[PDB]
Design an enzyme around this catalytic site. Sequence first.
Site, short mmCIF file in Angstrom:
data_model
loop_
_atom_site.label_atom_id
_atom_site.label_comp_id
_atom_site.label_asym_id
_atom_site.label_seq_id
_atom_site.Cartn_x
_atom_site.Cartn_y
_atom_site.Cartn_z
N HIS A 1 0.85 -1.20 0.00
CA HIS A 1 0.00 0.00 0.00
C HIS A 1 0.88 1.25 0.00
N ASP B 1 10.51 21.75 -25.27
CA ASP B 1 10.44 20.41 -24.67
C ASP B 1 11.41 20.37 -23.48
N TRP C 1 7.18 -0.46 4.74
CA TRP C 1 7.83 0.16 3.58
C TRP C 1 9.29 0.60 3.88
N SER D 1 14.80 5.87 -12.27
CA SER D 1 13.78 6.65 -12.98
C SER D 1 13.72 8.09 -12.46
N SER D 2 13.63 8.24 -11.13
CA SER D 2 13.56 9.56 -10.51
C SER D 2 14.86 10.36 -10.57
N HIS E 1 13.33 11.18 5.09
CA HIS E 1 12.71 12.47 5.39
C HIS E 1 12.66 13.34 4.13
N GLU F 1 12.36 12.46 1.27
CA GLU F 1 11.27 11.87 0.48
C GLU F 1 9.90 12.43 0.82
N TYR G 1 9.23 15.41 1.83
CA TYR G 1 9.18 16.79 1.31
C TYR G 1 9.10 16.75 -0.23
N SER H 1 -0.18 26.92 -4.88
CA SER H 1 0.07 28.34 -5.14
C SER H 1 -0.61 28.79 -6.43
N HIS I 1 14.57 11.93 13.65
CA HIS I 1 13.32 12.04 14.40
C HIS I 1 12.44 10.79 14.14
N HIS I 2 12.92 9.92 13.25
CA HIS I 2 12.28 8.64 12.94
C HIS I 2 12.95 7.55 13.76
N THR J 1 7.31 26.82 6.62
CA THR J 1 6.04 26.24 6.18
C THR J 1 4.91 27.19 6.55
N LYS K 1 4.38 29.94 4.05
CA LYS K 1 3.62 29.50 2.89
C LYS K 1 2.11 29.51 3.17
N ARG L 1 1.27 0.35 15.50
CA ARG L 1 1.21 0.31 14.05
C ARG L 1 1.49 -1.11 13.62
C1 HEA Z 1 0.70 8.99 -0.53
C2 HEA Z 1 0.62 8.07 0.45
C3 HEA Z 1 -0.61 7.39 1.03
C4 HEA Z 1 -1.97 7.57 0.79
C5 HEA Z 1 -2.66 8.48 -0.22
C6 HEA Z 1 -2.65 6.71 1.76
C7 HEA Z 1 -4.02 6.55 1.80
C8 HEA Z 1 -4.71 5.69 2.66
N1 HEA Z 1 -4.08 4.87 3.60
FE1 HEA Z 1 -2.16 4.71 3.99
N2 HEA Z 1 -0.22 4.51 4.36
C9 HEA Z 1 0.87 5.14 3.71
C10 HEA Z 1 0.74 6.04 2.66
C11 HEA Z 1 -0.50 6.44 2.14
N3 HEA Z 1 -1.76 6.05 2.59
C12 HEA Z 1 2.15 4.74 4.26
C13 HEA Z 1 3.47 5.38 3.91
C14 HEA Z 1 1.85 3.81 5.26
C15 HEA Z 1 2.77 3.09 6.25
C16 HEA Z 1 3.23 1.74 5.74
C17 HEA Z 1 4.06 0.99 6.76
O1 HEA Z 1 3.68 1.01 7.96
O2 HEA Z 1 5.08 0.38 6.38
C18 HEA Z 1 0.41 3.69 5.34
C19 HEA Z 1 -0.25 2.97 6.33
C20 HEA Z 1 -1.66 2.89 6.43
C21 HEA Z 1 -2.36 2.32 7.56
C22 HEA Z 1 -1.71 1.78 8.81
C23 HEA Z 1 -1.44 0.29 8.66
C24 HEA Z 1 -0.90 -0.35 9.95
O3 HEA Z 1 -0.15 0.33 10.68
O4 HEA Z 1 -1.24 -1.52 10.22
C25 HEA Z 1 -3.71 2.50 7.33
C26 HEA Z 1 -4.73 2.11 8.19
O5 HEA Z 1 -5.87 2.50 8.12
C27 HEA Z 1 -3.82 3.16 6.04
C28 HEA Z 1 -5.02 3.48 5.42
C29 HEA Z 1 -5.13 4.26 4.25
C30 HEA Z 1 -6.39 4.63 3.66
C31 HEA Z 1 -7.75 4.07 4.09
C32 HEA Z 1 -6.15 5.52 2.69
C33 HEA Z 1 -7.21 6.17 1.85
O6 HEA Z 1 -7.34 7.55 2.21
C34 HEA Z 1 -6.99 6.05 0.34
C35 HEA Z 1 -8.13 6.65 -0.51
C36 HEA Z 1 -7.78 6.72 -2.01
C37 HEA Z 1 -6.96 7.67 -2.52
C38 HEA Z 1 -6.75 8.97 -1.74
C39 HEA Z 1 -6.15 7.51 -3.82
C40 HEA Z 1 -6.69 8.47 -4.85
C41 HEA Z 1 -5.69 8.91 -5.94
C42 HEA Z 1 -5.76 8.41 -7.18
C43 HEA Z 1 -6.49 7.13 -7.34
C44 HEA Z 1 -5.15 9.03 -8.40
C45 HEA Z 1 -6.31 9.49 -9.25
C46 HEA Z 1 -5.89 9.81 -10.65
C47 HEA Z 1 -5.65 11.05 -11.10
C48 HEA Z 1 -6.14 12.31 -10.38
C49 HEA Z 1 -4.78 11.21 -12.33
N4 HEA Z 1 -2.56 3.46 5.52
C1 HEA Z 2 3.65 14.73 2.75
C2 HEA Z 2 4.40 14.06 3.65
C3 HEA Z 2 4.90 14.58 4.98
C4 HEA Z 2 5.19 15.84 5.35
C5 HEA Z 2 5.12 17.16 4.55
C6 HEA Z 2 5.56 15.75 6.77
C7 HEA Z 2 5.89 16.85 7.55
C8 HEA Z 2 6.29 16.84 8.89
N1 HEA Z 2 6.50 15.68 9.65
FE1 HEA Z 2 5.97 13.83 9.14
N2 HEA Z 2 5.82 11.96 8.46
C9 HEA Z 2 5.43 11.52 7.17
C10 HEA Z 2 5.10 12.35 6.12
C11 HEA Z 2 5.14 13.73 6.15
N3 HEA Z 2 5.52 14.46 7.24
C12 HEA Z 2 5.44 10.07 7.11
C13 HEA Z 2 5.11 9.21 5.88
C14 HEA Z 2 5.83 9.65 8.38
C15 HEA Z 2 5.97 8.25 8.89
C16 HEA Z 2 7.01 7.39 8.20
C17 HEA Z 2 6.95 5.95 8.64
O1 HEA Z 2 7.38 5.66 9.78
O2 HEA Z 2 6.47 5.10 7.84
C18 HEA Z 2 6.08 10.79 9.19
C19 HEA Z 2 6.65 10.73 10.45
C20 HEA Z 2 7.05 11.82 11.21
C21 HEA Z 2 7.80 11.74 12.46
C22 HEA Z 2 8.22 10.44 13.16
C23 HEA Z 2 7.17 9.99 14.16
C24 HEA Z 2 7.47 8.62 14.69
O3 HEA Z 2 7.67 7.68 13.88
O4 HEA Z 2 7.51 8.47 15.92
C25 HEA Z 2 8.05 13.00 12.88
C26 HEA Z 2 8.88 13.31 13.95
O5 HEA Z 2 9.15 14.45 14.26
C27 HEA Z 2 7.41 13.90 11.86
C28 HEA Z 2 7.44 15.31 11.87
C29 HEA Z 2 7.00 16.14 10.84
C30 HEA Z 2 7.03 17.56 10.87
C31 HEA Z 2 7.39 18.41 12.07
C32 HEA Z 2 6.63 18.03 9.66
C33 HEA Z 2 6.66 19.47 9.23
O6 HEA Z 2 7.21 19.61 7.90
C34 HEA Z 2 5.27 20.10 9.25
C35 HEA Z 2 5.31 21.62 9.21
C36 HEA Z 2 3.94 22.27 9.10
C37 HEA Z 2 3.24 22.93 10.06
C38 HEA Z 2 3.73 23.11 11.47
C39 HEA Z 2 1.86 23.46 9.70
C40 HEA Z 2 1.81 24.82 8.99
C41 HEA Z 2 2.41 25.92 9.83
C42 HEA Z 2 1.80 26.96 10.45
C43 HEA Z 2 0.31 27.23 10.30
C44 HEA Z 2 2.70 27.95 11.22
C45 HEA Z 2 2.60 28.02 12.73
C46 HEA Z 2 3.05 26.73 13.41
C47 HEA Z 2 3.66 26.63 14.60
C48 HEA Z 2 4.04 27.81 15.43
C49 HEA Z 2 3.97 25.28 15.18
N4 HEA Z 2 6.85 13.15 10.85
CU LIG Z 3 10.85 12.82 8.80
#
Ligand code: HEA
Ligand code: HEA
Ligand SMILES: [Cu+2]
Lengths: 58, 43, 73, 49, 105, 49, 46, 227, 84, 514, 144
Positions: J61, J91, J126, J156-157, J240, J242, J244, J255, J290-291, J316, J319, J438
């Site tokens: 997933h 292009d 993952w 690819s990327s 991390h 990734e 961003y 924007s 932080h992970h 952030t 923005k 989890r």
């Molecule tokens: C981009 C990343 C992404 C997205 C969108 C989602 C979407 C969803 N995920 Fe997520 N999920 C992860 C990334 C994501 N997840 C990751 C990183 C993990 C952790 C894995 C791990 O633990 O190793 C995770 C783990 C995870 C868990 C925890 C599993 C566990 O700990 O046992 C659960 C549980 O409910 C869950 C549920 C869902 C559900 C119900 C949605 C639903 O909201 C989905 C609904 C459908 C969509 C939002 C897709 C729509 C988009 C398109 C189809 C493209 C359409 C086409 C065009 C516009 C061109 N996910």
């Molecule tokens: C789109 C993807 C995305 C983005 C953008 C972020 C953004 C951020 N993430 Fe998240 N994060 C994930 C995807 C993402 N994360 C995923 C996939 C995991 C789990 C991975 C795994 O284990 O599988 C994870 C896990 C994760 C952890 C690990 C938790 C754990 O495993 O125990 C932490 C730890 O600090 C963290 C922190 C943050 C923070 C601080 C930001 C910051 O960038 C957010 C900054 C934004 C704001 C704060 C809001 C806007 C700001 C304002 C309105 C201004 C005023 C605010 C203040 C004064 C506070 N993230």
């Molecule tokens: Cu991180």
Amino acid sequence: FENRVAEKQKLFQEDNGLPVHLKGGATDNILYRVTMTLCLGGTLYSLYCLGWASFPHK
Amino acid sequence: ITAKPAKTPTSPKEQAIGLSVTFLSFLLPAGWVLYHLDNYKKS
Amino acid sequence: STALAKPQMRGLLARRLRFHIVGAFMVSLGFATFYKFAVAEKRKKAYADFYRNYDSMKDFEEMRKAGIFQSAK
Amino acid sequence: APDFHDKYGNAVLASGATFCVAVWVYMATQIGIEWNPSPVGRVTPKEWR
Amino acid sequence: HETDEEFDARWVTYFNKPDIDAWELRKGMNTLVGYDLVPEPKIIDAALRACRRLNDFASAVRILEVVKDKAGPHKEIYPYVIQELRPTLNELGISTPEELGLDKV
Amino acid sequence: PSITNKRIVGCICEEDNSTVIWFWLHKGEAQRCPSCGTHYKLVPHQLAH
Amino acid sequence: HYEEGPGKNIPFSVENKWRLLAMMTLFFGSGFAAPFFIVRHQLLKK
Amino acid sequence: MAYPMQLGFQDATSPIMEELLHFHDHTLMIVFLISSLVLYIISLMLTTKLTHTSTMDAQEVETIWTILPAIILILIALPSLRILYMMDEINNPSLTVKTMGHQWYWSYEYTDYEDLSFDSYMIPTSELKPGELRLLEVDNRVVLPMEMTIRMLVSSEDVLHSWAVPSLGLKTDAIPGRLNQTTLMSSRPGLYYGQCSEICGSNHSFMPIVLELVPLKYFEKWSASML
Amino acid sequence: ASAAKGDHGGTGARTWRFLTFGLALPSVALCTLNSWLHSGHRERPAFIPYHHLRIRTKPFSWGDGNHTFFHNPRVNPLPTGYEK
Amino acid sequence: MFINRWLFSTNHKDIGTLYLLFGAWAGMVGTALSLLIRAELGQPGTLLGDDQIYNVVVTAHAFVMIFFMVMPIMIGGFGNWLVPLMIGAPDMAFPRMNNMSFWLLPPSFLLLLASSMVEAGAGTGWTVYPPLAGNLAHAGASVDLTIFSLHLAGVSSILGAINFITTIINMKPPAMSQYQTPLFVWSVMITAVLLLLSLPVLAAGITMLLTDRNLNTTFFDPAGGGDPILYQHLFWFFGHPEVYILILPGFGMISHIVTYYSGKKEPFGYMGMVWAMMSIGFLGFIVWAHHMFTVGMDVDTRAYFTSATMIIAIPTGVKVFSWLATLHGGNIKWSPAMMWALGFIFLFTVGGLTGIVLANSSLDIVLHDTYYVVAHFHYVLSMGAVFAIMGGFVHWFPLFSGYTLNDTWAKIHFAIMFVGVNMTFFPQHFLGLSGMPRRYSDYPDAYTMWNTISSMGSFISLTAVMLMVFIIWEAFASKREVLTVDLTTTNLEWLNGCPPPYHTFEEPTYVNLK
Amino acid sequence: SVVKSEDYALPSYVDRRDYPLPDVAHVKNLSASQKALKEKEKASWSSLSIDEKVELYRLKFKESFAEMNRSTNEWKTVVGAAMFFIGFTALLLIWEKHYVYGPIPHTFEEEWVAKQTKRMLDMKVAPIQGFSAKWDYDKNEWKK
Ligand code: HEA
Ligand code: HEA
Ligand SMILES: [Cu+2]
Ligand SMILES: CCCCCCCCCCCCCCCCCC(=O)OCC(COC(=O)CCCCCCCCCCCCCCCCC)OC(=O)CCCCCCCCCCCCCCCCC
Ligand SMILES: CCCCCCCCCCCCCCCCCC(=O)OCC(COC(=O)CCCCCCCCCCCCCCCCC)OC(=O)CCCCCCCCCCCCCCCCC
Ligand SMILES: CCCCCCCCCCCCCCCCCC(=O)OCC(COC(=O)CCCCCCCCCCCCCCCCC)OC(=O)CCCCCCCCCCCCCCCCC
Ligand SMILES: CCCCC/C=C\C/C=C\C/C=C\C/C=C\CCCC(=O)O[C@H](COC(=O)CCCCCCCCCCCCCCCCC)COP(=O)(O)OCCN
Ligand SMILES: CCCCC/C=C/C/C=C\CCCCCCCC(=O)O[C@H](COC(=O)CCCCCCCCCCCCCCC)COP(=O)(O)OCC[N+](C)(C)C
Ligand SMILES: CCCCCC/C=C\CCCCCCCCCC(=O)O[C@H](COC(=O)CCCCCCCCCCCCCCC)COP(=O)(O)OC[C@@H](O)CO
Ligand SMILES: CCCCCCCCCCO[C@@H]1OC(CO)[C@@H](O[C@H]2O[C@@H](CO)[C@@H](O)[C@H](O)[C@@H]2O)[C@H](O)[C@H]1O
Ligand SMILES: C[C@H](CCC(=O)O)[C@@H]1CC[C@@H]2[C@H]3[C@H](O)C[C@@H]4C[C@H](O)CC[C@]4(C)[C@@H]3C[C@@H](O)[C@@]21C
Ligand SMILES: C[C@H](CCC(=O)O)[C@H]1CC[C@@H]2[C@H]3[C@H](O)C[C@@H]4C[C@@H](O)CC[C@]4(C)[C@@H]3C[C@@H](O)[C@@]21C
Ligand SMILES: C[C@H](CCC(=O)O)[C@H]1CC[C@H]2[C@@H]3[C@H](O)C[C@@H]4C[C@H](O)CC[C@]4(C)[C@H]3C[C@H](O)[C@]12C
Ligand SMILES: C[C@H](CCC(=O)O)[C@H]1CC[C@H]2[C@@H]3[C@H](O)C[C@@H]4C[C@H](O)CC[C@]4(C)[C@H]3C[C@H](O)[C@]12C
Ligand code: CUA
Ligand SMILES: [Mg+2]
Ligand code: NA
Ligand SMILES: [Zn+2]
């Protein structure tokens, strides 16, 4: 050796509508067909292998 | 944005058909597997 | 047959923003005050009240008599 | 000239809301789903030991 | 920036240019409505007369509509503006959007 | 300059503006930038003799 | 060279809305169904 | 343990967990405030017919929305770091217990004086005694003395696992070839539950942790009897 | 490395100014925050007359010949120990 | 002609189209997997089997949603389509290499599907941490097929990143400086720079896992003096950045969408937006641990990572407030795209804020590896990244196809998805605070209510996904051809009509230097 | 009046509150009477009839501001339809509970829950605020 780049420039600029990968002549066509045949054939073979590995042989 | 009228209008009846077919394409195969889950779990 | 007064015609959007940003701030303060009473203080007093005259041995005795322990019957 | 919304808007809103509420209330209370609510105020503790 | 009166004067002068062309007329109105304000009647008067010099009745009416629009929910602005513009509307023979039934949806 | 009868013009009205104003410039009378009014006139064809 | 314009800059045909419906159904349907069938495959091995 | 429909943290059993509850309340208030402020401003921007579409100057309002968040971050970091260092404080334990993670159970070792060790497995649902909790009970609990500073050492003999007890604010990864340390100190007697917190394979969901906190005297007799 | 930013289409005055105010000065402000936080006078250690420290092979050409140039009474003991 | 055009392409629009098609298909796969997850957790007990089959589903997933849906759509799809048009380029710099970036994805996807077909699949998470992912706890080809899938997606990327950076730096009009390019173009370049620097580290790390599994090396095996924690560092050093990489192009599209539907000619504080994205990109490389707050690191190291992580909130925040400032005083057009953008702003903020809660190593002790983390990332990914993709899709669909969608149906789609995602993820905060771990196929009885509600919300989202497919079909079936588009003076990508011709900008734009 | 696809490069007409005066007139081609009206427009506008003024407006613009800023009933359709599909979702859940889900664990039986609840109270689960704190140990009942 002698500089024959001008000969090559004439050959590759010849207005025959051929894409660059085939513009050198008949050999390009042969090399291309060999490449693509190995690629497509090898891909079908990999699919077969996946089908094989997907099932337990206890 | 402005656009011209549909070149091949899709009537409400046609939309019901497309929506139904779309939903069925997702629901049927998964439903089949999920329904036969027990038959899979132990066999 | 009365004339009309020249109303305010400049900076109406800015004027509206200023007024509501100030209001948002006031509501934030009121919420902070509320939260640090219905949640923060409530929590500190619940723990302080519980542990004030807490008797750990009495608590253990009750649990033991209820039979929850593997090591103490 | 009246569009789709003028003609059918009220009907779509009314029967959409009705259907939604009816089917969700049915799913939540008539099919054996265990919500597992809090025992607090509802369960009378019974001797286990 | 500048004072309110300097802003207004700059705008009145703009629309009062005798040989102002259609492009300049549109550019001026389209630019003016981007600001956080409803143009003072002296500005509108100058714009309406530019419409007269350009033989553009439709634009004169449209300018009246945009004045109303820029007021947003402040319903007291438009009627005051129209009041201040009455001598000019009468002189030039410009009918308000209301008088033309263009205010009804 | 253009080899056809229209060309897209991008006008950076003032030095350091981050916003570029884009529009097609057609053969004929000079046109003005929608934003700052500066004039542009297309002078068509040739390049390759 | 290639065809240009609405409905021509794509790898699938939109000439017939019903044939199109069939294509989209197979395309999106196969994607959504795949995981269920893989789960089924894993359950039927052991 | 967690109870049905729980919203927040399990009640604090140790002084450190109490500290985290207050810190979370503090941070959550800020989260509520900022998210509602943003929601509010979105609605404010979208609810007026008044317009201003010309160029707006930014180097003035950006100071405010850079300095304020900076101040707020510091107001979160201070208590955060104070607690962080507090958890690292030298405390000098009265007892050291080790726990080894295994593919699907935990083993414990109390080797300060005697060589005591045992395995701790989840009670199968089919074997639960009336009133026992599904997926949470174990055959052999980790008996420990209440109101005492204990040193827990965590490791693993196969894959990664993670030893956790939410009520005490504990979670230490179990890594093979590594001995991680954490300190435990319960303010009360009782049973405290936790679950393996690092994906470890087929029965990751089924290898719980149960701590039994009793007075020192009972802990000692239990120790002797467990030899 | 390549940093984590981008520009490079033409590094000029505007770009370096952007780096000055957007990266450099903010870094200095943070380190200034960190430093004027972790400061605080640390408790001076007990004096031990180690022979490899407080060296005196010739008196200094200033003061009483026994104080170092930037002598700090609070933290720099003389060969005989801390001052009164 | 068909093969020449679609298999041998050297056109940025056609290649972007291939990417959008691939990403849409991947989204269906990822949605099905997410339904399998929530079906298993929908009621107490075991539905599918033990944690192995369950975690094979959870792992796939994540890989599918991240590598095959989000990245291909945002970067390969929107990136290829829009970047050359937005700078008036004919292009991409390397049009042929661009085609290989695309064609590496289907093979990559095939390897991922192969890994779940052979043996018992890769139920590693993952993150693929050893020893669980090693040759003893995960013997057989599964984990190796997963590593190879990542290698292909990585190449690819990386080639895609080189192409984007070169195109953006080298192919703008001679008079256009980098500070005159649209924010989406900036978001793509910064994203490309992160990809260029982070993916090679991941490649290094997974290659070491591959050798530990097959060549008897012991980088992560204590028996040979290795360390499992070393893998975590190498993975998260990429991991991390990734996240961003997943949100930056989203920020870029937001924007444009907010600016466009606010009837504005430009976003508020352009230079502050560029500054914010660059800062975020930079800070994103120095916060990875932080992970790893529970692995047993020194307290000072933990204090540093807590502090460095929080700082990202500042740029952030600039923005977020700039997007609101762009709405300010606008003639708001309540189009479906604007709705997705407004939902993005609020929901991403919520997810970002819970990320700041997690940044605190103290609190993270209790929140780590619980559903509080899952709630945080689904708010920023399933609501943030996905809403930006949906918004961009509805906004630019008429440009790409030449046809319009039915706005009412698109507003209905947004409404359903909004309820669905919030019902799915909001309750997960409660489950996390209360301790639900989890990667669990079943949970203690106390967690039943929230898991039940969360699974119901996931079905609502399924309904929205199915409706979306129908909506796209309806657009292509009715064929309402676009006529006029407003604001072309500040949205160059629309200036060549809908759809633009195969070859655009054969004669470059004219831009004075003055 | 009638717009064409290949005219994307030419100035177009738009009805927008913030762009009151579009680049082109709504109607560019004029009939004999319309040409005559444009001529009459060069004289005093006081001599123009209401109908003639409305026609001059309609040649220049497509919709008036009142017309272009009108609100609609679309929200009814959107909200109603969204609810219908959310309602449809419940049908999928009903199907799932019926054909996919088996019985839940025996630990949810009423008697088990009553016993488990007493045991939780005996071990004093969450005594400060969460659970046991809600039980009156003296009066032996849930605190009123
Ligand atoms: C981009 C990343 C992404 C997205 C969108 C989602 C979407 C969803 N995920 Fe997520 N999920 C992860 C990334 C994501 N997840 C990751 C990183 C993990 C952790 C894995 C791990 O633990 O190793 C995770 C783990 C995870 C868990 C925890 C599993 C566990 O700990 O046992 C659960 C549980 O409910 C869950 C549920 C869902 C559900 C119900 C949605 C639903 O909201 C989905 C609904 C459908 C969509 C939002 C897709 C729509 C988009 C398109 C189809 C493209 C359409 C086409 C065009 C516009 C061109 N996910
Ligand atoms: C789109 C993807 C995305 C983005 C953008 C972020 C953004 C951020 N993430 Fe998240 N994060 C994930 C995807 C993402 N994360 C995923 C996939 C995991 C789990 C991975 C795994 O284990 O599988 C994870 C896990 C994760 C952890 C690990 C938790 C754990 O495993 O125990 C932490 C730890 O600090 C963290 C922190 C943050 C923070 C601080 C930001 C910051 O960038 C957010 C900054 C934004 C704001 C704060 C809001 C806007 C700001 C304002 C309105 C201004 C005023 C605010 C203040 C004064 C506070 N993230
Ligand atoms: Cu991180
Ligand atoms: C997998 C494919 C499914 C097969 C179905 C096809 C059947 C063909 C019969 C054949 C009958 C002949 C009919 C011919 C003409 C029309 C059909 C078509 O041409 O046939 C094929 C075409 C067209 O595709 C279709 O057929 C219909 C697609 C409709 C899509 C609508 C998308 C709407 C979203 C908007 C997108 C952007 C456009 C908007 C903007 C407009 C663009 C500018 O495709 C392609 O040539 C290229 C696409 C390549 C990759 C995309 C994803 C694949 C991932 C696979 C990985 C698998 C790993 C293992 C996985 C193994 C599984 C276990
Ligand atoms: C579907 C879930 C049903 C849950 C029902 C709760 C049952 C209450 C029993 C009522 C029983 C009362 C007795 C219980 C008190 C125990 C307090 C405690 O120790 O436990 C503390 C816990 C418990 O939380 C609470 O103290 C209650 C807060 C509830 C907030 C609800 C927002 C609901 C929005 C509606 C739809 C959700 C999606 C919206 C998105 C919001 C994003 C978070 O704190 C948390 O960490 C949970 C929330 C975490 C993170 C979210 C932060 C951002 C929020 C944004 C707000 C937008 C508002 C605009 C308005 C929203 C407009 C959309
Ligand atoms: C001082 C302030 C007070 C002033 C009072 C107001 C005065 C108005 C001034 C007046 C200022 C100008 C306002 C009018 C301009 C154009 C009106 C029109 O001609 O065009 C007509 C249009 C315009 O639409 C609107 O106009 C209102 C729709 C707003 C949608 C906002 C979506 C936001 C998404 C992001 C969420 C976070 C931010 C939300 C923030 C929203 C803020 C409004 O009508 C529609 O049909 C579109 C909306 C359809 C459906 C609702 C969206 C679904 C949301 C998700 C939950 C669904 C639950 C249902 C399914 C339920 C199943 C359980
Ligand atoms: C504030 C930061 C900047 C540093 C310089 C500023 C002021 C000092 C004056 C001149 C320094 C120039 C060069 C350095 C020469 C010797 C080292 C001086 C570095 C310094 O200033 O060191 C100080 C010692 O000062 C001492 O002896 C200083 C005694 C002064 C004697 C100068 C002797 C000059 C010797 C010069 C030889 C020069 C030959 C140069 C050759 C060049 C190539 C041909 C340290 O103070 P302290 O109390 O011991 O410890 C601090 C305890 N709280
Ligand atoms: C967590 C921390 C964050 C919390 C809160 C931050 C919110 C900030 C609150 C208030 C900001 C006050 C800005 C003051 C600017 C005055 C507005 C104005 O009125 O806008 C213009 C000024 O240009 C200009 O600065 C440009 C126009 C306006 C400039 C600023 C507008 C943006 C304001 C922000 C938008 C809301 C988003 C807030 C985010 C929280 C008007 O120009 P003039 O009068 O010269 O010309 C008009 C012609 N005259 C002379 C005849 C009248
Ligand atoms: C077994 C385990 C995993 C295996 C993965 C294997 C993946 C792919 C293998 C097959 C690929 C080889 C085919 C040759 C590729 C050459 C690309 C190239 O040379 O691309 C060039 C661009 O990159 C440039 O210059 C500069 C960049 C040159 C890049 C060379 C490509 C090498 C591919 C591997 C990269 C690995 C990533 C490294 C980081 C660890 C040319 O660009 P074009 O668009 O063609 O033309 C533009 C025209 O104007 C030229 O006249
Ligand atoms: C998470 C994604 C999935 C969401 C839930 C799916 C929604 C329901 C879809 C319905 O699908 C089906 O329903 C059946 C029953 O209603 C099946 O019939 C089956 O059951 C029967 C009737 O009881 C028999 O007539 C046949 O043998 C039979 O296979 C069936 O095969 C399957 O196509
Ligand atoms: C054009 C096509 C590529 C199709 C594609 O890109 O998928 C190429 C060109 C030439 C190749 C063919 C060559 O003619 C050699 C092969 C031997 C036979 O004589 C015919 C088919 C044959 C087995 C090949 C099939 C064909 O699909 C190839 C591989
Ligand atoms: C033939 C060519 C002269 C230029 C020409 O081609 O007309 C000569 C000049 C220099 C080259 C030579 C260089 O001196 C370097 C090499 C030295 C020799 O030891 C072996 C061959 C050697 C590798 C080269 C072969 C020779 O044939 C080259 C290629
Ligand atoms: C100098 C540079 C570009 C200005 C330009 O050439 O247009 C601008 C763009 C963004 C600005 C930054 C952002 O506005 C964020 C910060 C805002 C505070 O008001 C000062 C420092 C602050 C860090 C700013 C410093 C500097 O003014 C920056 C970096
Ligand atoms: C985490 C990484 C070690 C990875 C590994 O064990 O392979 C180490 C290497 C160097 C360390 C950094 C440097 O030692 C410098 C700093 C020292 C401070 O005590 C903490 C933060 C500080 C910034 C360190 C954080 C972290 O522990 C780093 C970044
Ligand atoms: Cu042991 Cu998870
Ligand atoms: Mg972990
Ligand atoms: Na389950
Ligand atoms: Zn200009």
